[PDB]
């Protein structure tokens, strides 16, 4: 209970009401003469409610009158000429009304009634915003009131008689108004952050006594006069708390780190100081002697007005009122309750239900250790492919995406299906075509779909992914051409059947000695051998052999299965090239090294440009003139060199990418030949296809040679090699850019020869 506003008589005060400051008042409006206090609350609807809490109950509410117009301000003081009895003044936008709450008793405590009798009223030719009251001048036994119109005008009414009205000078919004008696001065906080004190006689005669530029505008201003030892004007700014002397300067000030709402300096306890009370918009009250925080306690609501009064035989009760309607009397809670878990015996652990669930989850744990069909169809004719995807449940967040190759291009790449209801079918259609010059490494294409399965643990569903492959037609990136006779590079695939007519396999390429020209210019020749069973493929580039060699083999298989023959091989006696292959590897690595050199050059140029630019900047900061044309003509040269180097790095990146795409086809063909040359199974072909065909393009941290060399070293180390000195010295796996391709070539040749010597591939 420590540091909480412990409750007392409290009540919510309406049905979506609206209150402000000046609504809550706390005095002896009934004029009982005893000394207790009665909580008065006006509203922005009209509900003037007066309570006398007796701790809710129903005897508390003295009355709940409803006046027509909203109640801006409520005050209690000697607002009538003759009598010296406290009256109740209520201020509406255009009306001032002074009542007299007279209560007459009944024989039983719930038979006594209270009436508010209108003692007088003044019409306001201007729309008020607030008001203050005091003994204007030095008149005794009177509390005459000054009302501030919202357009900056102090209309002073001596009770029952409109005295005068003076326009405050230089004000746009209205601010908080207070009245000091030790100096007989009105004090305002105008819109230009200026606390201004005017003398009452100067106003009555009409200018500004004094001013003080506080840094903000003020919510409330309380000139507290319970103590006469030294008057002090308290100001609650919208960010700071001030206490000001009577001459004008700051007696002291505190920089609140919160947003205050209301404050009230109540009576002081020490000598000279003044205890004050400030409420946050964090619904917390702070008790501050001078600027020192003497206490802090959590309010239930963000107070709009706080008072401290004597209510039913208890002094210093805090009375807060919000703008919702929460009105609450309270005291401060000073019980440092112990921090201990409660020693309850009824509340025990339902071990059976909890243990069933725990055994279920532990079962799933110990078990973890031990629905969408995608199909792509390629039309036989920029060929148009159509992907059909179907489900069996209500899948959600479906995304389909197609990846063909670098050279090949798609017209549509991504398709998003947010939700598809169960056992339904979707069908997308895109079209793929060649864009570039070189031929792609494979005419394959992949369509990958990713969806989410809604489950019981997660309502957003597990993410799942499924993929399908399609095979584009050779006649997309090729056409028939004139068959050459003697080309530079050649490879011969021998088969154990009868040499088949080339016009059968390739019927859109017509001729039993065929020639192919690819979009881009490359040309390949296919010779059916008439005396032997073999075929021969030739071209001036070792890369262009792969697409035709692949299609020869694939369509041979398809033809011999369509016919009905089963026995068929593609033996390829001879030797795997390993010499026109290494040339492409060396070309690729030369491009990589050039790129690294250019990147270092660009690093140096950028550092130099930065240094010169910082020199120029420091020159720009200095106020005095200074010749610098040398510096900017150095900057221009460095910048043109930077542009040159950037364009060169772009060129090298493109050249390296083309070299990588040609090397992909080279290594495709080399794996094909090694698989035909040693009769490799499908798994032993997949291991090669994973070791030799690692990634899609070279990046500045991972490239081709490092990956393929690490993989080949591991395979040689744990599958073929036996000696340990070799396994540790020569066969080493590292993943940084090499210094030369010597080790990669040594390992590829060693891999080939140790495959030739009976060794076979495994994984572990």
């Amino acid at each position: 209970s420590l540091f909480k506003a412990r409750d007392w008589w409290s009540t919510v005060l309406g049905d979506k009401e609206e209150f402000d400051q000046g609504c809550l008042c706390l005095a002896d409006v009934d004029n009982t003469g005893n000394g207790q206090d009665k909580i008065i609350v006006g509203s922005f609807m009209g509900y003037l409610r007066i309570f006398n809490p007796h701790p809710a109950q129903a005897e508390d509410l003295l009355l709940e009158v409803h006046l027509r117009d909203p109640i801006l301000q409520v005050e209690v003081g000697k607002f009538v000429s003759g009598t010296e009895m406290l009256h109740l003044a209520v201020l509406h936008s255009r009306k001032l009304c002074v009542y007299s709450v007279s209560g007459t008793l009944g024989n039983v405590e719930h038979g006594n009634q209270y009436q508010i009798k209108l003692m007088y009223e003044h019409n306001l030719q201007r729309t008020a915003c607030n008001m203050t009251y005091g003994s204007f001048g030095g008149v005794k036994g009177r509390d005459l009131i000054c009302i501030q119109s919202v357009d900056g005008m102090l209309m002073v009414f001596e009770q029952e008689s409109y005295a005068f009205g003076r326009f405050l000078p230089g004000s746009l919004l209205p601010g908080p108004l207070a009245y000091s008696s030790r100096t007989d001065s009105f004090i305002t906080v105008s819109s230009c952050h200026q606390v201004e004190s005017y003398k009452y006689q100067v106003l009555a005669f009409a200018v500004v006594d004094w001013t003080l530029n506080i840094g903000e505008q003020a919510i409330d201003i309380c000139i507290v006069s319970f103590i006469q030892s030294a008057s002090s004007v308290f100001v609650l700014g919208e960010r700071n708390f001030f206490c000001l002397k009577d001459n004008g300067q700051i007696q002291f000030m505190k920089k609140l780190d919160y947003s205050p709402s209301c404050f009230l300096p109540y009576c002081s306890v020490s000598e000279g100081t003044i205890n004050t009370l400030i409420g946050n918009h964090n619904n917390m009250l702070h008790i501050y002697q001078d600027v020192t925080l003497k206490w802090a306690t959590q309010l239930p609501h963000v107070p709009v007005a706080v008072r401290v009064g004597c209510l039913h035989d208890l002094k210093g009760v805090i009375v807060t009122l919000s703008d919702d309607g929460h009105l609450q009397c309270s005291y401060l809670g000073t019980d440092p309750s112990l921090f201990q878990a409660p020693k309850v015996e009824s509340r025990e652990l339902n071990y059976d239900e909890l243990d069933m669930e725990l055994k279920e989850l532990q079962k799933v744990i110990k078990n973890v250790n031990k629905d969408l069909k995608v199909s792509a169809m390629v039309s036989p004719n920029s060929v148009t492919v159509k992907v059909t995807l179907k489900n069996r449940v209500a899948l959600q967040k479906i995304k389909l995406s197609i990846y063909v190759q670098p050279p090949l291009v798609l017209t549509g790449d991504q398709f998003t299906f947010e939700f598809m209801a169960p056992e339904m079918t979707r069908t997308v259609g895109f079209s793929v075509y060649l864009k570039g010059s070189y031929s792609p490494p494979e005419l394959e294409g992949n369509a990958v779909v990713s969806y989410s399965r809604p489950t019981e643990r997660n309502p957003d569903g597990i993410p799942r992914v499924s993929q399908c492959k399609f095979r584009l037609p050779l006649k997309l990136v090729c056409l028939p051409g004139q068959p050459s006779k003697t080309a530079s590079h050649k490879l011969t695939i021998d088969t154990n059947k009868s040499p088949v007519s080339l016009l059968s396999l390739f019927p859109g390429f017509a001729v039993n000695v065929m020639g192919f020209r690819f979009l881009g210019g490359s040309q390949v020749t296919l010779l059916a051998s008439k005396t032997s069973q073999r075929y021969r493929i030739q071209s001036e580039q070792f890369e262009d052999l792969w697409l035709i060699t692949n299609e020869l083999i694939i369509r041979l298989q398809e033809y011999f299965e369509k016919q009905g023959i089963k026995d068929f091989t593609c033996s390829f006696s001879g030797s795997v090239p390993l010499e026109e292959y290494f040339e492409l590897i060396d070309h690729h690595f030369e491009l990589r090294i050039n790129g690294e050199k250019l990147e270092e050059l660009l690093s140096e140029r950028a550092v130099q440009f930065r240094a010169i630019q910082r020199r120029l900047l420091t020159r720009f900061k200095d106020k005095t003139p200074a010749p610098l044309q040398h510096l900017d003509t150095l900057l221009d040269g460095t910048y043109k060199q930077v542009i040159a180097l950037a364009d060169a790095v772009e060129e090298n990146q493109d050249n390296l990418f083309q070299s990588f795409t040609r090397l992909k086809s080279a290594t495709h063909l080399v794996i094909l030949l090694i698989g035909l040359w040693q009769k490799l199974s499908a798994d032993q072909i997949a291991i090669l296809e994973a070791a030799f065909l690692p990634l899609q393009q070279d990046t500045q941290e991972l490239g081709w040679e490092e990956t393929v060399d690490a993989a080949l070293s591991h395979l040689l180390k744990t599958c073929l090699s036996k000696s340990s000195k070799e396994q540790a010295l020569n066969l080493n796996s590292q993943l940084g850019i090499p210094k030369d391709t010597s080790q990669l070539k040594k390992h590829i040749t060693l891999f080939c020869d140790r495959l030739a010597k009976g060794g076979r591939l495994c994984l572990s």
Binding site: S603, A606, L617, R619, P625, D632, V642, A646, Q700
Partner: protein
């Protein structure tokens, strides 16, 4: 007005210098990921900002030298007024003119330079 123009120019040049430092950082970033289109665009923007800032430097230094000329004219005028009188009136007139210019009371300045 020289004061005000120099203030505005210094504000603008501070803005552009902050822009240039941001672009230096951004260009270093684009170059660390070998993204050359964006790097070249940062370098183009830096070139343009340097051109604009050099124009601003030229105009600022021109106005600044004019401001120095004006300040020297004012100080030399106070000195020419004081130098016209021998003895104790000299520093009297000097401090009087200094106080009449720190308060921008030009008419009092000329009054004390005429007879005072």
């Amino acid at each position: 007005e020289y004061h005000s123009v120099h203030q505005k120019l210094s504000a603008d040049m501070a803005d552009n210098s902050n822009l240039i430092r941001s672009l230096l950082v951004q260009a270093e970033d684009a170059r660390l990921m070998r993204d050359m289109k964006t790097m070249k665009n940062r370098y183009k923007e830096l070139y343009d900002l340097n051109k604009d800032l050099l124009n601003g430097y030229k105009i600022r230094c021109n106005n600044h030298t004019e401001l120095l000329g004006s300040l020297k004219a004012v100080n030399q005028a106070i000195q020419r007024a004081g130098h016209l009188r021998v003895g104790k009136p000299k520093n009297q007139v000097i401090t009087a003119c200094r106080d009449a210019i720190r308060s921008n009371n030009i008419n009092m300045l000329f009054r004390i330079m005429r007879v005072g």
